[PDB]
Amino acid sequence: WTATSGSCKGRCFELQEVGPPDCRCDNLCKSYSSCCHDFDELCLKTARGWECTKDRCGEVRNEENACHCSEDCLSRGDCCTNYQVVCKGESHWVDDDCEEIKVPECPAGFVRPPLIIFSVDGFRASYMKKGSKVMPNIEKLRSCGTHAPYMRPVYPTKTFPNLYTLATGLYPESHGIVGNSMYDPVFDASFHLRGREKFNHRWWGGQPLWITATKQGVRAGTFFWSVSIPHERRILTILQWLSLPDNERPSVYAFYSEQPDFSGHKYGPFGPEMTNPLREIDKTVGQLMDGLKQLRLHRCVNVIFVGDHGMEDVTCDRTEFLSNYLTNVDDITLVPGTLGRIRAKSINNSKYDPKTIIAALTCKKPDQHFKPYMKQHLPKRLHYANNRRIEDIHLLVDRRWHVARKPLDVYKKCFFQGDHGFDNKVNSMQTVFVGYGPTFKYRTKVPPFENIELYNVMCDLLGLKPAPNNGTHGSLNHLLRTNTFRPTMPDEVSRPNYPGIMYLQSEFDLGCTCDDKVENKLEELNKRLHTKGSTKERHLLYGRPAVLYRTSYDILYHTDFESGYSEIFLMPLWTSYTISKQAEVSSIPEHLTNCVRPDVRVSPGFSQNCLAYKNDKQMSYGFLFPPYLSSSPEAKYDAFLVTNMVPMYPAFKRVWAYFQRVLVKKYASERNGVNVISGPIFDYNYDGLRDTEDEIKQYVEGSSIPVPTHYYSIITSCLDFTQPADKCDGPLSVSSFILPHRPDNDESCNSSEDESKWVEELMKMHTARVRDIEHLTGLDFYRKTSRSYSEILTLKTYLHTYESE
Numbered sequence: 115w116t117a118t119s120g121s122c123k124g125r126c127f128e129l130q131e132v133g134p135p136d137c138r139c140d141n142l143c144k145s146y147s148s149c150c151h152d153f154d155e156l157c158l159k160t161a162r163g164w165e166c167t168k169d170r171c172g173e174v175r176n177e178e179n180a181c182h183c184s185e186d187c188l189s190r191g192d193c194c195t196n197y198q199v200v201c202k203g204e205s206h207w208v209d210d211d212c213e214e215i216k217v218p219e220c221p222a223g224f225v226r227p228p229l230i231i232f233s234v235d236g237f238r239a240s241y242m243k244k245g246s247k248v249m250p251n252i253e254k255l256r257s258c259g260t261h262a263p264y265m266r267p268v269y270p271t272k273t274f275p276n277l278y279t280l281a282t283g284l285y286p287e288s289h290g291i292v293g294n295s296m297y298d299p300v301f302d303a304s305f306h307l308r309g310r311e312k313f314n315h316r317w318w319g320g321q322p323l324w325i326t327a328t329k330q331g332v333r334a335g336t337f338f339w340s341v342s343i344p345h346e347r348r349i350l351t352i353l354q355w356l357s358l359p360d361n362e363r364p365s366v367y368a369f370y371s372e373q374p375d376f377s378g379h380k381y382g383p384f385g386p387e388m389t390n391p392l393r394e395i396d397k398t399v400g401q402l403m404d405g406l407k408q409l410r411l412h413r414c415v416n417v418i419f420v421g422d423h424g425m426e427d428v429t430c431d432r433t434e435f436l437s438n439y440l441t442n443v444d445d446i447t448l449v450p451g452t453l454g455r456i457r458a459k460s461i462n463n464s465k466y467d468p469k470t471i472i473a474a475l476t477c478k479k480p481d482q483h484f485k486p487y488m489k490q491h492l493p494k495r496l497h498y499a500n501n502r503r504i505e506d507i508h509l510l511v512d513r514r515w516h517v518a519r520k521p522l523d524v525y526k527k528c529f530f531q532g533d534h535g536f537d538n539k540v541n542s543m544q545t546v547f548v549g550y551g552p553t554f555k556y557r558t559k560v561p562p563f564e565n566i567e568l569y570n571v572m573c574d575l576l577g578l579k580p581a582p583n584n585g586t587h588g589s590l591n592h593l594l595r596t597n598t599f600r601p602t603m604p605d606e607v608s609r610p611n612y613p614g615i616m617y618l619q620s621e622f623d624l625g626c627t628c629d630d631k632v633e634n635k636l637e638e639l640n641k642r643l644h645t646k647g648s649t650k651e652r653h654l655l656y657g658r659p660a661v662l663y664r665t666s667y668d669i670l671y672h673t674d675f676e677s678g679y680s681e682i683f684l685m686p687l688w689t690s691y692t693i694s695k696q697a698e699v700s701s702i703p704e705h706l707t708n709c710v711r712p713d714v715r716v717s718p719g720f721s722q723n724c725l726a727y728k729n730d731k732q733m734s735y736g737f738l739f740p741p742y743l744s745s746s747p748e749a750k751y752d753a754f755l756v757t758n759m760v761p762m763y764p765a766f767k768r769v770w771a772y773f774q775r776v777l778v779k780k781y782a783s784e785r786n787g788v789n790v791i792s793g794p795i796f797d798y799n800y801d802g803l804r805d806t807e808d809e810i811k812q813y814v815e816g817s818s819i820p821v822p823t824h825y826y827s828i829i830t831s832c833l834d835f836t837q838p839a840d841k842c843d844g845p846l847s848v849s850s851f852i853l854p855h856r857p858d859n860d861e862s863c864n865s866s867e868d869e870s871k872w873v874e875e876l877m878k879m880h881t882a883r884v885r886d887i888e889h890l891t892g893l894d895f896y897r898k899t900s901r902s903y904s905e906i907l908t909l910k911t912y913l914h915t916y917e918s919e
């Protein structure tokens with residue numbers, strides 16, 4: 115109950131929220147149904163509209179007007195934004211030449227340039243070019259400030275998950291807003307866009323920018339605008355707050371527009387009806403910049419123009435229906451649309467079975483427009499699993515499609531022509547970023563980057579210390595003129611052993627055989643040098659990875675490859691090798707088909723054994739350095755050492771063997787040599803983070819050989835591909851992947867065919883950032899390059915997307 119009897123006089127859009135049931139005059143009062151009786155009258159004035167005209171210039175103040183054109187308005191901070199233009203012969207901000215802002219030019223008593231986040235919903239990246247004719251204010255921001263060709267949202271590419279990722283630096287799985295609809299089994303509560311429950315603080319994890327600011331003594335304006343407050347009034351409110359006294363004035367502000375998303379759902383992303391909403395958003399930006407110019411803050415404020423997600427063409431006829439796959443359709447609850455989430459309708463039903471639901475949804479129709487996944491099998495780049503609000507069964511829906519439970523759901527709920535929510539690598543889902551102001555660079559293009567990175571930068575912009583988040587702080591230093599964060603490399607926690615020859619062959623009883631007893635002082639010295647690391651500068655180009663946790667491991671050198679071998683996991687944490695453009699692929703000789711060789715540097719007690727693989731009928735083995743790429747028949751024996759062996763399901767070995775036999779050589783030819791680092795990943799609790807040994811759920815039968823959940827590779831070469839990978843003077847180029855280690859190829863519908871038709875497609879789906887692999891392994895790569903650390907940080911966050919341009 116709200117006692118709405120008090121008044122909002124002198125309190126309109128008050129910053130602090132008063133204790134109920136006293137009536138509120140803050141922006142959120144509309145949302146809680148708790149405003150004072152006179153809120154609309156006093157705080158939402160509209161009389162005479164939003165612009166000055168010639169006849170209002172120097173008028174007598176009239177407190178009823180929406181904004182003012184009287185002489186006292188500047189000092190009151192409540193002129194219409196076009197006031198100086200209409201009445202003082204000033205130009206609009208957009209008509210001024212742009213001039214570099216080398217230093218903040220701020221009024222006296224400003225302690226730091228304010229930050230204004232101008233956020234727009236549904237603003238697809240290509241609108242910057244395709245709508246450029248009708249968005250001159252936005253185009254001036256873009257071309258004069260710092261911009262990216264696009265910014266990658268998080269998955270799912272919905273509004274609340276993305277704005278709250280912007281606010282926190284966190285993946286949706288960590289901040290908890292994992293969709294637009296949600297059930298939390300612990301609370302036994304549901305979250306919906308419409309309604310009241312969404313305001314409860316228990317949904318909202320991490321620490322958003324406004325709370326980070328407040329805790330550290332920086333005041334914030336409102337971020338969540340009540341939907342009924344018009345845009346012109348949000349702008350005027352920001353401008354008024356900016357005229358407050360130094361002690362009361364916020365340093366950080368947000369504006370939000372529900373356009374062009376709102377129209378894009380109705381008309382599709384490029385419907386002719388979309389021109390007008392783009393014009394209107396540009397008008398609003400003009401109003402802000404004119405308003406800042408009046409207050410003399412246009413060369414003082416940092417402005418971020420940022421979208422939450424794009425928009426794709428999606429109509430009712432492109433809907434897949436679970437009723438066409440499942441007979442039990444009434445025993446499930448589906449969260450539908452541009453992604454699918456499935457759980458049992460009733461928790462009292464023990465006849466509900468996720469295994470057969472997945473199977474009934476797998477490759478059932480030739481052009482099926484969605485793919486079912488257990489959430490832990492989703493591409494790791496999506497970081498979408500470690501939350502009880504994310505259902506075990508997930509459907510990744512093709513772009514341009516919807517999924518629904520039954521047809522009745524679609525017509526008793528064509529309306530829409532646009533939607534979003536798909537995989538965050540999809541081009542149509544990409545959004546925008548522009549930074550403009552004294553702290554941003556002048557006329558600078560930067561590469562595309564992920565919205566999870568912005569929280570750190572907004573904190574830098576405000577001199578705040580960021581709460582722990584998923585950005586990689588320093589990876590966006592190149593956006594900034596100053597206030598950069600100067601990160602240091604993490605310290606290595608475990609130093610390696612360097613074992614020499616310590617064991618005789620007969621000490622090993624591993625049940626392994628090799629046809630290798632085939633027998634020179636010129637080349638005896640040669641092999642000794644190779645085992646001591648004489649070729650190491652060729653295969654380990656960027657230094658050895660640092661191990662950032664406590665463990666026991668050995669560096670092992672070979673002619674063709676170097677490895678960091680874990681005595682705990684009985685396999686390499688990483689294997690590093692370089693394949694030049696000229697390298698030759700050979701095959702595994704017949705006499706060496708089943709060969710596995712004890713490694714005399716490593717004890718039997720810390721080795722895998724062949725018997726275990728023999729006894730395990732499901733599990734086979736593969737090698738991290740491929741025998742196919744050996745530099746000589748004699749170097750090929752190294753590739754069969756028991757220390758290069760890793761456990762692999764036969765179904766996975768189809769993938770692995772094709773990558774090693776065909777793809778590495780193809781990349782080396784295309785990229786002028788590549789350096790490859792490969793290894794196992796263990797993520798049994800799907801938290802995106804390296805498992806400790808007591809978290810491993812599966813071993814090769816009868817042994818303590820742990821089974822990886824994934825295998826990674828990091829493939830690096832010279833960005834200037836006229837230089838070979840092993841002699842590169844400048845910036846690097848990388849692509850990486852994290853392939854799920856699965857006992858079937860059910861994920862790939864065309865897998866009965868030749869690997870050349872399906873494997874590369876699979877690997878592209880499972881593209882990754884080197885940073886994702888760092889989290890999953892506790893390793894730190896690129897420790898020794900000639901490149902600045904901030905540049906390496908940007909490389910480590912790079913994602914190779916495989917979308918066209």
Ligand SMILES: *[C@@H]1O[C@H](CO)[C@@H](O[C@@H]2O[C@H](CO)[C@@H](O[C@@H]3O[C@H](CO[C@H]4O[C@H](CO)[C@@H](O)[C@H](O[C@H]5O[C@H](CO)[C@@H](O)[C@H](O)[C@@H]5O[C@H]5O[C@H](CO)[C@@H](O)[C@H](O)[C@@H]5O)[C@@H]4O)[C@@H](O)[C@H](O[C@H]4O[C@H](CO)[C@@H](O)[C@H](O)[C@@H]4O[C@H]4O[C@H](CO)[C@@H](O)[C@H](O)[C@@H]4O)[C@@H]3O)[C@H](O)[C@H]2NC(C)=O)[C@H](O)[C@H]1NC(C)=O
Nearest residue numbers: 287288289290318319320500501502582583584801802889
């Ligand atoms: C992306 O960035 C983020 C942020 O850095 C990374 O997430 C962090 O990872 C840490 C490890 O997973 C985790 O640290 C744990 O915190 C526990 C206490 O946490 C509370 O306090 C923090 C800080 O204020 C708060 O942020 C947390 O908020 C979570 O929980 C609420 C719901 O309860 C949500 O509102 C919120 O969204 C958030 O949920 C998310 O995280 C939790 C995990 O905390 C998930 O379960 C959710 O799915 C969701 O994703 C918390 O309120 C602390 O208790 C833990 O300590 C245990 O483990 C350590 C190991 O060192 C051990 O020493 C202790 O003994 C202890 O073990 C005991 O508990 C065990 C489990 O119950 C039990 O088995 C043992 O036997 C022991 O009794 C731990 O330190 C940190 O909280 C999160 N932070 C956030 C914000 O998510 C994330 O990893 C990054 N992602 C990637 C890929 O890099």
Ligand SMILES: COCCNC(=O)c1cccc(-c2cc(Cl)c(C)cc2OCc2n[nH]c(=O)n2C)c1
Nearest residue numbers: 231233277278280281313318337338339340368370
């Ligand atoms: C009690 O509530 C829990 C608190 N949660 C929020 O405060 C919240 C929720 C969601 C989006 C944001 C949010 C975040 C950022 Cl970073 C930006 C720039 C804009 C944002 O919202 C803009 C907005 N105004 N009106 C509206 O409908 N939206 C989406 C903020």
Ligand SMILES: [Ca+2]
Nearest residue numbers: 797803804805
């Ligand atoms: Ca883990």
Ligand SMILES: [Cl-]
Nearest residue numbers: 272293294295
């Ligand atoms: Cl959703």
Ligand code: NA
Nearest residue numbers: 727730733734
């Ligand atoms: Na086997």
Ligand code: NA
Nearest residue numbers: 859860862865
């Ligand atoms: Na298949």
Ligand SMILES: [Zn+2]
Nearest residue numbers: 236375379534
């Ligand atoms: Zn939308």
